[PDB]
């Protein structure tokens, strides 16, 4: 029933976990506790097989552990800065090559899978710092420039006309801008990892930089030069929607160093580079 | 089904492209690859006719390539400036002879057709620059003055009463103004091009200026003179809705120089005036 | 117009909210989804797979 399923959604009881059944003492030549990890399979033994369990009705649900839930939280992916210091024409606009590689928190979650397909919800949080006292009337323009489209080189570049590109105009005092983007790849899923190159020579590029071009985000303060200088910082947040993921993998164990690459740095004392905490010995809890 | 068509709209699968069917080796006196371009027709040969193709189910859709989609994006067509410098009465109001000829991006798209019919969505983005520090309380008035109606000559002209003309009042801090205009022509479609005059003498005007009079947009800062001077720039955006276009044509290949005319300038080295990039020779890719 | 009452919370941005929003790329049709082995629908699937315990993780 689309109404019974509705109730399960509100109560978050779509994916229930199995109950524990009562078990009894056993004496058999069937030894579930014994197996062979060499097979590459996990022993499917359950608590009822190793101890005498009581009957217990499980009420836990796995809804929150779903992929949609795990990757469905909006996190920061970029912090754009427009700092008016001494030249309005040069400092009132900027650009960013879009990617989800610059902020560790969301990057690590997505990288727990090899491939992922999803639509994106982008939410922007602009904050205007009054360096000289006033902020005046701040109006911002955020333009999505897909690869190939002309990139503005001045604050009055014709490209800002946005005759085809999508632009979002925000006015200080109005709610935070937000829009959705459909799965953008030319492939069936996004590559979280890519063991390939864009050629076959010693100078060919390696990794996701080869497959993950998302274009550029061009910003500018629409308002013309004002007496008082401001510093506008626009933080970009991303949330995956209608998500699918494939081939889970080991979580990032060391700090990230660069975008689109798994490269890392190691110090002289490696235990400082990983979350593992040195044990005094094998028997010290 | 109006509900099945609804699903296709959400998924953007209204216009599907044909599949590729499996083909086989052939030996015939029917040679599809041979034709005669002199006829003025394009050879309708398909991949199945020149190679042995496999069967492939197409999932691509042409929805986004529709005329409605192509011309249905809001782009800048005008940037109105009210700059208070030394005389509020003279600098607090202005006028603009409406047209879609001043901004290259949208002009070029519409000019890929000879005639076009559509309703228009006008969105305005006003931004108040505080030249002296404060902006006070800015209230703007945008009045559409159809040809023939009295044009204001002062900021307190009786014409601002707008007893019949449509006026939009915007208050700083409120969302961007927006309104729709129905297809305005006295003809069945707008002329993107017009090989005609408004008379038959050496002094008759030539081109779309003869057929495309849309009236004037008169603006003024409603707020009376304030101590601190401001510069209000209102950018006008246009989007075509419920569109139809006829007789496609070659895209503009050189920069535009003036409104309502196809005139252009040529330098001593013409390859700099077009997007064509000189080839080293016929065999250098 | 319909009389409305703006409730507390309006205009805020909560990173875990679940609202709808306009699409920046109207009419765009995403690439057809193909079958890829190894799909994961719930993290519990990953918790049920054995991984090694770095039990002898002394500093040396």
């Amino acid at each position: 029933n689309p109404v019974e399923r509705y109730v399960d959604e509100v109560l978050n009881e779509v994916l229930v976990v199995p109950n524990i059944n009562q078990s009894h003492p056993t004496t058999s030549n069937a030894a579930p506790v014994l197996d062979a990890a060499e097979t590459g399979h996990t022993n499917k033994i359950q608590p009822e097989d190793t101890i005498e369990t009581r009957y217990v009705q499980s009420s836990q649900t796995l809804d929150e552990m779903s992929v949609e839930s795990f990757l469905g939280r909006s996190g920061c992916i970029h912090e754009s800065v427009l700092d008016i210091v001494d030249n309005y024409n040069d400092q009132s606009f900027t650009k960013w090559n879009i990617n989800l590689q610059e902020m560790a928190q969301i990057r690590r979650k997505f990288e727990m899978f090899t491939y992922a397909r999803f639509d994106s919800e982008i939410t922007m949080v602009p904050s205007v710092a009054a360096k000289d006292g006033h902020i005046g009337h701040i109006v911002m323009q955020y333009m999505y420039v897909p690869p190939g489209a002309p990139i503005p080189t001045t604050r009055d570049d014709y490209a800002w006309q946005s005759g085809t590109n999508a632009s979002v105009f925000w006015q200080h005092g109005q709610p935070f801008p937000r829009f959705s983007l459909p799965f953008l790849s030319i492939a069936s899923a996004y590559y979280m990892f890519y063991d390939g190159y864009d050629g076959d020579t010693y100078k060919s590029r390696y990794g996701t930089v080869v497959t993950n071009d998302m274009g550029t985000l061009c910003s500018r303060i629409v308002t013309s030069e004002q007496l008082h200088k401001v510093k506008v910082v626009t933080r970009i947040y991303h949330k995956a929607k209608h998500t699918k993921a494939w081939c889970p993998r080991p979580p990032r164990a060391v700090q990230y160093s660069h975008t689109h690459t798994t490269n890392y740095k190691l110090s002289s004392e490696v235990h400082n580079d990983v979350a593992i905490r040195p044990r005094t010995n094998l028997t010290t809890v | 089904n109006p509900v099945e068509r609804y699903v296709d709209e959400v998924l953007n699968e209204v216009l599907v492209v044909p599949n590729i069917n499996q083909s086989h080796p052939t030996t015939s006196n029917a040679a599809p690859v041979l034709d005669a371009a002199e006829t003025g027709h394009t050879n309708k040969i398909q991949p199945e006719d020149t190679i042995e193709t496999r069967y492939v189910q197409s999932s691509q859709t042409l929805d986004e390539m529709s005329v409605e989609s192509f011309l249905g994006r809001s782009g800048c067509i005008h940037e109105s400036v009210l700059d208070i410098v030394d005389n509020y009465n003279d600098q607090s109001f202005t006028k603009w002879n409406i047209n879609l000829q001043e901004m290259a991006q949208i002009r070029r798209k519409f000019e890929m057709f000879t005639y076009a019919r559509f309703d228009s969505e006008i969105t305005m983005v006003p931004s108040v620059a505080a030249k002296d520090g404060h902006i006070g309380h800015i209230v703007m008035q945008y009045m559409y003055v159809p040809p023939g109606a009295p044009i204001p000559t002062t900021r307190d002209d009786y014409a601002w009463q707008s007893g019949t003309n449509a006026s939009v009042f915007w208050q700083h801090g409120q969302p961007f103004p927006r309104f729709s205009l129905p297809f305005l022509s006295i003809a069945s479609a707008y002329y993107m091009f017009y090989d005609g005059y408004d008379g038959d003498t050496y002094k008759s005007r030539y081109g779309t200026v003869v057929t495309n009079d849309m009236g004037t947009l008169c603006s003024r800062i409603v707020t009376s003179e304030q101590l601190h001077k401001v510069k209000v720039v209102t950018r006008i955006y246009h989007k075509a809705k419920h569109t139809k276009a006829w007789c496609p044509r070659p895209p503009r290949a050189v920069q535009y120089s003036h409104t309502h005319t196809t005139n252009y300038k040529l330098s001593s080295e013409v390859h700099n005036d077009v997007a064509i990039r000189p080839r080293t020779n016929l065999t250098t890719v | 117009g319909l009389p409305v009452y703006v409730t507390p919370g309006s205009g805020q941005f909560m990173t875990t909210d679940d609202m709808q929003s306009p699409c920046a790329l109207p009419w765009y049709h995403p690439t057809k989804e193909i079958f890829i082995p190894g799909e994961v629908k719930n993290l519990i699937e990953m918790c049920q797979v054995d991984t090694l315990i770095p039990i002898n993780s002394t500093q040396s």
Partner: peptide
């Protein structure tokens, strides 16, 4: 779109925009 259900407990699954990408989080399973 309104995917109206009935049971009376009526469910109104409304899609305010015309693109799939615009809707909220997906259902599970």
């Amino acid at each position: 779109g309104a995917q109206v259900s009935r049971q009376s407990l009526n469910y109104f699954n409304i899609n305010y925009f015309k693109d799939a990408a615009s809707s909220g989080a997906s259902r599970l399973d």
